[PDB]
Amino acid sequence: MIVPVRCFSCGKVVGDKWESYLNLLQEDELDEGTALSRLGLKRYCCRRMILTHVDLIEKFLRYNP
Amino acid sequence: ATLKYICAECSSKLSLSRTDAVRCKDCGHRILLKARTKRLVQFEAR
Amino acid sequence: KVFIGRLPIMLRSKNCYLSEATESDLYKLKECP
Amino acid sequence: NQEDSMIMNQSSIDRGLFRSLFFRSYMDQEKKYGMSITETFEKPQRTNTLRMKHGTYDKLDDDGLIAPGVRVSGEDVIIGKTTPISSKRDASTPLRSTENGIVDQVLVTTNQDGLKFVKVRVRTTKIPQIGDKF
Amino acid sequence: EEGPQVKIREASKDNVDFILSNVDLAMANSLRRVMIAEIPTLAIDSVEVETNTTVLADEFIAHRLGLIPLQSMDIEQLEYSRDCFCEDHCDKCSVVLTLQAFGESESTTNVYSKDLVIVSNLMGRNIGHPIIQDKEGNGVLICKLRKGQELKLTCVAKKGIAKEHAKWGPAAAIEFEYDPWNKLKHTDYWYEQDSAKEWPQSKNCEYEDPPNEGDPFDYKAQADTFYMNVESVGSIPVDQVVVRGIDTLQKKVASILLALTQMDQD
Numbered sequence: 001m002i003v004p005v006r007c008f009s010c011g012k013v014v015g016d017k018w019e020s021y022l023n024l025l026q027e028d029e030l031d032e033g034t035a036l037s038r039l040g041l042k043r044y045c046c047r048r049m050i051l052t053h054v055d056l057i058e059k060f061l062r063y064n065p
Numbered sequence: 066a067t068l069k070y071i072c073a074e075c076s077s078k079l080s081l082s083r084t085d086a087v088r089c090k091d092c093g094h095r096i097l098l099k100a101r102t103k104r105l106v107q108f109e110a111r
Numbered sequence: 112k113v114f115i116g117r118l119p120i121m122l123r124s125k126n127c128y129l130s131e132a133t134e135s136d137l138y139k140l141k142e143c144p
Numbered sequence: 145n146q147e148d149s150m151i152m153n154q155s156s157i158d159r160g161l162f163r164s165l166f167f168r169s170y171m172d173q174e175k176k177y178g179m180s181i182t183e184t185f186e187k188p189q190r191t192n193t194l195r196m197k198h199g200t201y202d203k204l205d206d207d208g209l210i211a212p213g214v215r216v217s218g219e220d221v222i223i224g225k226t227t228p229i230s231s232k233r234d235a236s237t238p239l240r241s242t243e244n245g246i247v248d249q250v251l252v253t254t255n256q257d258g259l260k261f262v263k264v265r266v267r268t269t270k271i272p273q274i275g276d277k278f
Numbered sequence: 279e280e281g282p283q284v285k286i287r288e289a290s291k292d293n294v295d296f297i298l299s300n301v302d303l304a305m306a307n308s309l310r311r312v313m314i315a316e317i318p319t320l321a322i323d324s325v326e327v328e329t330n331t332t333v334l335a336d337e338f339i340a341h342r343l344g345l346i347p348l349q350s351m352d353i354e355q356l357e358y359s360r361d362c363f364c365e366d367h368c369d370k371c372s373v374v375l376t377l378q379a380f381g382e383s384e385s386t387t388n389v390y391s392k393d394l395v396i397v398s399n400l401m402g403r404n405i406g407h408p409i410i411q412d413k414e415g416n417g418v419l420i421c422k423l424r425k426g427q428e429l430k431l432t433c434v435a436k437k438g439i440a441k442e443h444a445k446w447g448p449a450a451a452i453e454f455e456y457d458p459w460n461k462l463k464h465t466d467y468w469y470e471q472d473s474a475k476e477w478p479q480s481k482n483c484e485y486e487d488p489p490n491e492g493d494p495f496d497y498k499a500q501a502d503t504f505y506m507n508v509e510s511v512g513s514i515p516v517d518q519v520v521v522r523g524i525d526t527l528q529k530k531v532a533s534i535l536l537a538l539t540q541m542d543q544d
């Protein structure tokens with residue numbers, strides 16, 4: 001269900017960090033807690049933002065017309 | 066150039082009217098959607 | 112030999128097509144996995 | 145925020161916090177009459193009956209339906225139907241008076257009895273506002 | 279120099295940790311607010327949709343397009359559509375982007391902040407360029423599409439501020455602390471045994487003189503020195519988020535005088 005452009009609570013964009021984050025994960029094999037930090041996501045508001053998103057859309061796409 | 070309907074599976078434009086049933090050319094799958102409007106719709110962006 | 116009416120089937124039961132189908136199989140049937 | 149009511153961050157409501165989609169679907173058929181008499185999915189006008197509806201019919205195409213992009217509201221007519229009886233007594237379906245939104249997906253088909261079966265679906269986004277529950 | 283004063287510690291393209299001192303909590307705060315809510319900016323505020331075979335809904339997509347930060351340097355030289363004289367809008371008060379995507383690939387095709395193509399004349403001025411800080415140079419993933427999914431829009435950015443809506447805030451977040459060694463006694467730490475042991479000390483304690491038990495309570499005390507850290511989203515240069523803030527707040531107090539004059543006439 002797509003990555004939230006900008007964090008609800010404070011405002012920092014987060015629209016881009018998705019792919020990055022999903023990468024420092026399966027490739028660079030880091031642990032979430034850090035990956036986020038690498039991505040500049042300090043305070044937990046913006047932090048819970050990425051760490052919790054469920055990118056449903058990927059399933060949504062697996063449909064058809 | 067201009068369309069009226071579409072098929073659920075074989076997403077293929079149709080266009081009909083009364084009498085010619087409500088099926089499709091090839092696969093029966095007698096559903097069919099109704100393709101967007103020509104007069105584009107506008108949205109607030111908030 | 113003779114037909115005696117219709118018996119409503121339960122989804123995901125043996126007699127139901129979905130019983131066998133797989134992910135991709137389903138997504139194609141438009142059924143949420 | 146007293147007595148079980150809360151204060152919500154408006155800013156957050158804007159950045160998309162707690163918004164949701166809402167769909168709704170009106171349905172309809174073309175009734176048959178044993179010794180051949182049927183209804184019609186069309187956009188009527190007077191023509192004897194006057195049995196119309198207060199709301200606008202204009203958002204209606206000629207198949208007696210609305211194009212998936214059209215925005216509806218008050219009691220606009222979503223479906224056009226008529227019944228002949230002894231010339232045009234109405235049978236059209238208008239959008240639920242309270243609601244409003246945007247047509248999302250109109251579907252045309254036939255039922256077992258070769259009946260013209262149609263299903264419309266209007267879509268809306270609902271935003272957390274003062275009276276809402278959480 | 280003269281009055282209130284800064285001591286910018288750290289600093290960058292997205293932050294300005296500084297030390298505004300010799301002011302009034304009151305005034306520090308006001309500045310703090312204005313930065314968050316009343317600095318003009320350019321944001322997408324209208325979206326016509328010609329086509330959308332996306333898995334997302336029209337307004338779903340629009341919501342985000344408005345969230346996408348846009349270049350607002352010369353924003354102060356673009357008028358508010360409300361003020362402009364054009365029946366509706368024009369290049370004198372609005373930027374018009376375009377967006378189009380097609381599932382060309384045989385594998386999930388993305389759509390990015392970058393894909394917006396300005397189409398109105400910018401009468402030469404920094405405005406409406408989708409702000410990108412993303413490594414690959416894409417910025418904000420608007421949405422994705424499968425096989426033959428399409429999407430044809432048209433956006434119209436207009437001026438605007440945070441009050442009217444959040445997408446106009448260039449703020450993002452704003453750190454603010456003062457009197458790290460509870461001296462003014464503007465608090466009362468909760469505790470189980472020792473307040474001091476139980477409550478973390480802030481990095482700001484260093485930049486300031488410790489307590490010294492013996493000493494009596496200083497009632498004449500007052501709040502000076504505020505350790506603030508003004509982030510930014512990019513729509514505007516961190517430094518500017520501060521100046522333009524100081525500047526707006528300034529205009530605000532201004533009008534009060536001005537109006538307080540047009541009144542004198544009678």
Ligand SMILES: [Zn+2]
Binds near residue numbers: 007011044047049
């Ligand atoms: Zn945040």
Ligand SMILES: [Zn+2]
Binds near residue numbers: 072090094
């Ligand atoms: Zn077909």
Ligand SMILES: [Zn+2]
Binds near residue numbers: 363366368369371
């Ligand atoms: Zn204008």
